[model samples]
Target chain A: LSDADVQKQIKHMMAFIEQEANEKAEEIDAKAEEEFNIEKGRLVQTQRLKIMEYYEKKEKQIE
Target chain B: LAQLFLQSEAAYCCVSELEELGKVQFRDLNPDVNVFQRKFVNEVRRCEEMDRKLRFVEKEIRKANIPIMDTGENPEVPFPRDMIDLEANFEKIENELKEINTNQEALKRNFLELTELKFILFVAGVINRERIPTFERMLWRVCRGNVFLRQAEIENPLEDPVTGDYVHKSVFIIFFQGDQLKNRVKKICEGFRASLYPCPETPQERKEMASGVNTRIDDLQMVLNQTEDHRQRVLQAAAKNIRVWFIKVRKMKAIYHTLNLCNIDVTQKCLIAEVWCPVTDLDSIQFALRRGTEHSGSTVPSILNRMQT
Candidate 1:
């Protein structure tokens, strides 16, 4: 293809790929937020903390 | 006045003990692995999305008849200004993925060790078999406490360590704090006849304790596996993006070589490559420079000044 055509194609590809990459980065951030949210909530609630630890210890002790 | 003071003190002592019990149980048992687990899940999901997008874009590039190559001197190759930058940034993103993977592996190893510890304790009667209810409560407590403790640990590095260097010294520091808090609570529980310090020793008790520990380990393992799966997906996606960007940049460079005008200052020459690039990818800029300089057999800025006509 002509240089003009190649140039046009390259520009289009760059823009398209970069857009997707940016979107992917955003998604990663969102997922991190989601994870932090879930864990953070569990930590704050005092009662839940006890149950979690006890069970974890108990599991390791099992025969 | 003395009665009121003692009552308040007693009540505070009781509450504090309960809190401590919860904290200790959690720290010793679960260590609130959910933080790492969630991280794994998030990372995996992100990587998968990145992978899918990269593949789709690659397919589109193929369909567009774009020659992903650098041909000999011809002075007509054009590409996005920030392509090189974008590629460099992509490398950074990949590094982030690797970091996440490292974290996941560590979490898994910790979980396995903790599980083994629990099994040993159960078999040895260090933890009573009959205290299933107490054990369950303790597990959740550990989870909650660990969540808080781990948060502090993770955030501490970002904190002004100058505030309390000793406090943030080691994970051991947190471990000791958790233990102290738990023991203090246990001592208080003893006053109320609900102590978790002296575990029971009956055969039935031991059997039940065994069951409880087994069940808890199972749950923890499930969550850990889920998180690991997510991390793997991210690793793959990040790798794919890096590959595609490399190909695109290489092709642009080849085309620049063919144009006999490699040194064109893109700014001066009205011949900007009409392509879109990821704003974050910086490597694309380097590729542009390589291709542009290759064509003019001179420096890029000088060639561009000449071509600006």
Candidate 2:
């Protein structure tokens, strides 16, 4: 291949690598955020019930 | 790329068909409905903020390892006189529970260590039962009561070098404090012609050196059990109130969300609601809206203005 042809091929390869990295990073970040949110939601819901239950028994005793 | 092309083609087809159906129009309704809609929007906004605060509270409670009841029917509960006071009470309970739980966990960890130590002691007793008194006295005096011993049974016997016979022997772990005393103990064991193997020091045995660890385990276990009961009582108190509060908040949000759907022109003193319908199903949409307004006993007439193509 000519020197100019090689340079063109390198340019295309660099763009391909950059695009691939960007897509992979985006996918990884999205997945991590999703997992964190899911765990946070579960934790909050369970703890909310516990707090509610704790207060309910106290009310009954006071009554 | 083919799928993306197909999706956009479908979307284009939909838009062209809608264009044929003509321009969408707006209408005016009773002004009183506008007031209610505005009120509903404000209430919904407040409910959203409250929901956000509750979500944060959930995060905090989980960190404390508070017990959650997975299932139970909710009973009727009156709204708190002041929401601020109720939240403050919740914060207080969280702090109290967190402190108690920390202490309880610490005690439980200590108890577990003691249990493992007891097991080691029991195994040592089984192996050196005949020389229990002498072994105990010598170990306690040399280490100044800071030592742990574990005995393990050998699966395979050693081969006698001269007799060409296998000899069975037990293994013992003599854990002790300080390097100087540890060497002295190793020397003493060698003097008795006992073979030695290096034993890795375990945290449980190290903590077991403090006298009364066994007795404290029993005492701490009892307190832990009682604290758990108390924690449950505290949570149950809040749980009974949650259902009622949740229902009320939901009811308010629903009303506000419905009100938000109405497009009201305050200056014109009218309420207008816009809906997208297929040309063929336009009649059904009109019937549904009329039926709904009639059932609600609202005398306010709803006018439909279909855009001309």
Candidate 3:
């Protein structure tokens, strides 16, 4: 291939890699965030339950 | 992996770092070994917990609706000083609460054990604490020590009218080798005016055991009361700062977790972020980091490698 033609092909390849990397990164991040939020919600509920039980026991002690 | 650091003007100094790339992917290659991911999850969870607590407090704030000094312009973000203090405070309270809960549970288990001992002792009507060892020694001697005896003192003693003295009878539940051994132990008890009482399947040493348990229970109750009060105070203190702390922590967590999309190594003094970025976008990434870190005052950027993507 001529020098100019080779340069064009290299540039084209770089664009492809960039596009694919960006897309993959977005997909992974979105999925991780979704899972993180779900786990976070469950943990919040669990903490609430723990605090609730503690308060209940504390009340009983007073009574 | 590409290494990068984002420092922004926002209170946390990293909030605006990832804005250039709308989104990024992060996966824990070795889920077990990824310390940052574990920390990311923990920080996120802590913020969520704090959010709930703050919301609960905010509800009270709304209900009371007390007027306060009105600042004409409220900054969108918290002050860095406040953020730092709130984080430290959150950390302190969490550690304190954990320690208190552990101590409380331990004391609770101890109290339960003491209660069980009391129950066992109350049921056994064994007289004279000194005679306990003698009873065990006698049974062992008669039965060649091939016996298990659970003994206790009686609650109410019968009166010997002739002597006008209280008759304190000891109850013993004896487990022996066989019927022959049982009979021999019974004869030995009879010889000492200790007749064969019906042995219960389940069974204390003496009045000494009874008194000791009571005293210990009292002592533990006092300690538990103090611990309970301390726990309540620490919880209340955390509650007081929960609103501001929660907001700042959530922001801090969002920035760190998003940044964590790239593998990041952190130490006491520095953070080294690594990620696989598009090779062509190196210039833009470099430009973004320089712009982002210009005002943060702490970061020193280093772009270590540029090889085939």
What TM-score against the true chain A does chain A of each candidate get? 0.62, 0.76, 0.71
User: Could you tell me which 10 consecutive residues in candidate 1 chain A have the lowest summed lDDT?
Assistant: A1-10
| Residue B192 displacement (Å), model 2 | 28
Candidate 2 lDDT by residue in tens digits, A1-63: 256654664565466557878999999999999999999999999999999999999999999
| Per-residue lDDT over B1-309 for candidate 1, one digit per residue giving the tens place of the 0 to 100 score | 000011212222222232222221111112343523323344334334444555544453454444444233322222454554564466465555556557766665655444433433323211222343453345345432231211112222222212322222111111223455567545534443221333334478666775686677678678767765664554455445445554444444433222211112234432211112333322333344344344433333311111111
The C-alpha stretches of model 3 lying farther than 4 A from their native spots are: A1-63, B1-76, B79-89, B122-172, B175-206, B255-309
Tens digit of per-residue lDDT, candidate 3, span A4-48: 654664565466557878999999999999999999999999999
DockQ, per model, reads 0.01, 0.00, 0.00
Instruction: Give one digit per residue, the lDDT tens place, for model 3 in B6-54.
Output: 3323213433554434333233334354644444566566556656555
Residue runs of model 1 more than 4 Å from their true location after superposition: A1-63, B1-78, B122-220, B238-240, B251-309
TM-score of each: 0.26, 0.32, 0.34
Q: Residue B279: error of model 1 in Å?
A: 40
Error of 3 at B107 (Å): 1.1
